Design a binder for this molecule. Structure first.
Ligand SMILES: CCCN(C)C(=O)CCCCCCCCCC[C@@H]1Cc2cc(O)ccc2[C@H]2CC[C@]3(C)[C@@H](O)CC[C@H]3[C@H]12
Ligand SMILES: CCCN(C)C(=O)CCCCCCCCCC[C@@H]1Cc2cc(O)ccc2[C@H]2CC[C@]3(C)[C@@H](O)CC[C@H]3[C@H]12
Lengths: 234, 234
């Protein structure tokens, strides 16, 4: 049911991790990229656990699970960051001990442009009063949607049909949440659209972020890493 | 009204332009990039005329009109291409005299990857049976939405509020179209979501296309070009 979908997603939420650095040492000696890389690397392991709990995800082939996570990982990191930063105007809560403003983004060439986008997205979330139940629906939508247009064998046709069925169930769930909040039918469809259009901007920001990461010529999980992490034993 | 919005958008549609090349000359001697650049350059002029007819667009400042078109131009070109290609499986109808398959995209390094995405998007449009009235709504949404998160003066706050009001009116229009087609309330909100999620993929494809164009180090309209074209006399 829609209420069961909501509880499942909320129950699956990953933990909020801390940055790893000597708090009794001067900040200017740290590698900003080192801290951010190390944080994301640890978040990615919990990402895989969360993804396996998104209803419908483990019904797909391992190959298609990997394709979806390879497309979506940075969008999923970024929507979590924007959500964890919503109540910190002007700052990005990478971790509770790593709350950064835009001037701190200037320590890495090209990064302040990305921080500005993330900050503006968190502002948009605040303006709309995004609720946590909506947040978990949108994050699941990113996981299922971001790689689905870039997979026509029979099995692929079946995998795409299943993804679109799950996506439709999440839509039904978002509408149900909004009807419960007292929105009119018109406000429900307007708010659904506003939320989904924000996903376009998250995609944009992920593309700009990935371009920035690739420009360091080093900071990106490989196909084989994600495959090994998703291909678990019992 | 919603019906008036639909008629206004349909009436504003740009013409379908032809590629410029000697049809009595061998194809292998043409510059593929030359043909594609020259086509897009001519489409951009008609783009500006169309944008000025999207309800609400000319109410914005010239500066914000330019920002929106600078963000959105390639997405708007690409959604038109995908729409003009819907009934040509396996081909991209850049122009009626320039219908290209994926092997023709291999003549420019890096381009076949983009052609594959565009082709897969046109397939998705065919699968959903996208209607022309829906197409014009989605194209207007791209224009209004793609640059709205990347503009907090009072005037900017007013410009963003107006954009979001127009966007909400287009949502209402898309729902109205779907109710008229006989869809249930559930199918209406599911189809609205499916359409808006495709816009995320169009954004993605524009980002990959822009990366490809910038990699030629040359093929992109400048801020000053768009400003001069939008800043018309009477
Ligand atoms: C084959 C084995 C592979 N082997 C050897 C490995 O070590 C495998 C590890 C491979 C994964 C390594 C990925 C590291 C990604 C770091 C992302 C970084 C942290 C972060 C964290 C967040 O929560 C939310 C968002 C963001 C990003 C936002 C956009 C930013 C600011 C960009 O502009 C520059 C930095 C970016 C931020
Ligand atoms: C300051 C004055 C400036 N000055 C001097 C000028 O000349 C101002 C002209 C500046 C504008 C020039 C932009 C040229 C853009 C060409 C885009 C090209 C044609 C096209 C047409 C479509 O309808 C739909 C889509 C697409 C694109 C899809 C993605 C593709 C395949 C990429 O992978 C490589 C080619 C791309 C396709």
């Amino acid at each position: 049911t829609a209420d069961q979908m909501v509880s499942a997603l909320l129950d699956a939420e990953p933990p909020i991790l801390y940055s790893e650095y000597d708090p009794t040492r001067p900040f200017s000696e740290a590698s900003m990229m080192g801290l951010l890389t190390n944080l994301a690397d640890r978040e990615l392991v919990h990402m895989i656990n969360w993804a396996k709990r998104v209803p419908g995800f483990v019904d797909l082939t391992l190959h298609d699970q990997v394709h979806l996570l390879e497309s979506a990982w940075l969008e999923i990191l970024m929507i979590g960051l924007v959500w964890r930063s919503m109540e910190h105007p002007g700052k990005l809560l990478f971790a509770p001990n790593l709350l950064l403003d835009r001037n701190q983004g200037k320590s890495v060439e090209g990064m302040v442009e990305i921080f500005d986008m993330l900050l503006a997205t968190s502002s948009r979330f605040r303006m709309m009063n995004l609720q946590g139940e909506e947040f978990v629906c949108l994050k699941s939508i990113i996981l299922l949607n971001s790689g689905v247009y870039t997979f026509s064998t029979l099995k692929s046709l079946e995998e795409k049909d299943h993804i679109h069925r799950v996506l439709d169930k999440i839509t039904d769930t978002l509408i149900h949440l909004m009807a419960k909040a007292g929105l009119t039918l018109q406000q429900q469809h307007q708010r659904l659209a506003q939320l989904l259009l924000i996903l376009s901007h998250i995609r944009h920001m992920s593309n700009k972020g990935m371009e920035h990461l690739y420009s360091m010529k080093s900071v990106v999980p490989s196909y084989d890493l994600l495959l090994e992490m998703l291909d678990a034993h019992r």
